[PDB]
Amino acid sequence: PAYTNSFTRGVYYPDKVFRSSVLHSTQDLFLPFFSNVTWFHFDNPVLPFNDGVYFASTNIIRGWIFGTTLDSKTQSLLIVNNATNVVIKVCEFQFCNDPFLGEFRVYSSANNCTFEYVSQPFLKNLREFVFKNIDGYFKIYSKHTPINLVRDLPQGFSALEPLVDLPIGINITRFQTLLALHRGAAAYYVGYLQPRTFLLKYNENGTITDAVDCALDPLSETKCTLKSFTVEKGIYQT
Amino acid sequence: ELLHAPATVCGPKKSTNLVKNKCVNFNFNGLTGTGVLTESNKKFLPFQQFGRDIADTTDAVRDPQTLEILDITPCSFGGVSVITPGTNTSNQVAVLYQD
């Protein structure tokens, strides 16, 4: 339950429209800069969902579970990456009191299915994800980058590319992680998204390189209201 | 609903061959406009569908059945002016097509 600074992580492509050499300001659910993310360690509790989540880790992790009531009474999302074939279902699964994998065992009693989807998954490296349920769609963003530190997150900048958009339209209010259990510990972080406004910086290729949070401090508010990453001497009304 | 995602549920109308370097009126998944289509050096990432310009103007697109980028540029337009020395002197004129 330790706390770690989120720094400048959790920026994703918001609109899926090509741009180049221009700054664009948009409003969406972004992870605030220099926030506090809960650091876990081994145990598998259940956590809320709120408006989204930011997931990071450093092949022990074996999928996630999203739902609202569980116990086969209400629909629950399923994501698992086994045998290089990720399979997604929304069937009525009854969940054990302490779900762990180690064939599969967590996802037994598959019945009353409504949705089905299969694709090919892709592989000192961090794996970051953003899960968001908006207007009846389940959107996922991800990126894999090499790292050289385990104590805390890197302080660089990196943007997340869209991966999957599923038309499910299921209400979600709770979720938990799933990791393979055999008889080395694993560590992962959890953040939360809030409706903040950002100013994005684009490159010649169209890759996001810089971004400023308009509600972090007065200087960033001045930058956002001036639509520039540099400001000259003077006094400005914000 | 519309205008929320790339189009997936279309009508039964047929397609037509693609032409280049000619002011034509195109139709790309319901996107209507006029202009000339030329090859471009913009390196679209695999997930985007089209580019965009200010004042809500489409600048570049990729086409169905070929996955090739195509530029768009409006065909020429401008003003016109008439040079005259006066009806009291002559009846001859000159014409200037601006820019």
Give the Cα separation of B71 and A178 in Å (integer): 47
Give the Cα separation of A230 and B38 in Å (integer): 37
Tokens (6 digits) for B50? 């089209």
Tokens (6 digits) for B67? 């996955």
Q: List beta partners, residue A164.
A: A140
Query: In the 8-state DSSP scheme, what is residue A93?
Result: P
Shortest alpha-carbon distance between residue B57 and chain A (Å): 12
C-alpha separations of B95 from B79, B82, B87 in Å: 11, 5, 16
| Helix or strand holding residue B95 (H, E) | strand B94-97
Judged on CB neighbours under 10 Å (0-12, 13-18, 19+), A63 is: buried
How was this structure determined? It was done by cryo-EM
Question: Which residue of B4, B42, B52 is in closest CB contact with A17?
Answer: B52
Query: In the 8-state DSSP scheme, what is residue A188?
Result: E
Q: What is the CA radius of gyration of chain B?
A: 21
* Residues in chain A within 8 Å Cβ distance of B44: 18, 206
Q: How many CB contacts within 8 angstroms connect chain A with chain B?
A: 30
Test mutation, B3, B42, B71, chain A, max A CBs within 10 A: B42
Resolution (A): 3.1
Which residue from B46, B93, B44 is spatially nearest to B70, judged by alpha carbons? B44
B62 near A CB under 8 A: no
**Within 13 Å, how many C-alpha atoms sit on residue A178's CB side?**
23
Q: List beta partners, residue B36.
A: B73
Type of residue at A217: D
Contact B50 A17 (CB under 8 A): yes
Type of residue at A60: I
Exposure b/e, A83-113, CB count within 10 A at least 16 = b: eeebbbbbbbbebeeebebeeeebbeeeeee
A205 near B CB under 8 A: yes
Type of residue at A119: S
A162 near B CB under 8 A: yes
Q: Give the sign of the dihedral formed by CA A223, CA A227, CA A232, CA A238.
A: negative
Exposure b/e, B2-26, CB count within 10 A at least 16 = b: eeeeeeeeeeeeeeeeeeeeeeeeb
Nearest 5°: CA angle at B81, between B78 and B87?
165
Find the residue in B nearest to A21 (Cα).
B53
C-alpha separations of A92 from A78, A173, B72 in Å: 10, 16, 50
Domains of chain A: 2-238 (2.60.120.960)
* Residues in chain A within 8 Å Cβ distance of B42: 18, 20
Nearest 5°: CA angle at B26, between B21 and B31?
135
3-state helix, strand, coil in chain A (%, to 5): 5, 40, 55
Tokens (6 digits) for A137? 């769609």
B47 near A CB under 8 A: yes
Phi-psi region of A169 (alpha: psi -120 to 50; beta: other; left: phi over 0): left
A183 near B CB under 8 A: no
DSSP symbols for B72-92: EEPPP---EEEE---TTT---
Give the Cα separation of A126 and A129 in Å (integer): 10
B48 near A CB under 8 A: yes
B34 near A CB under 8 A: no
Q: What is the CA radius of gyration of chain A?
A: 20
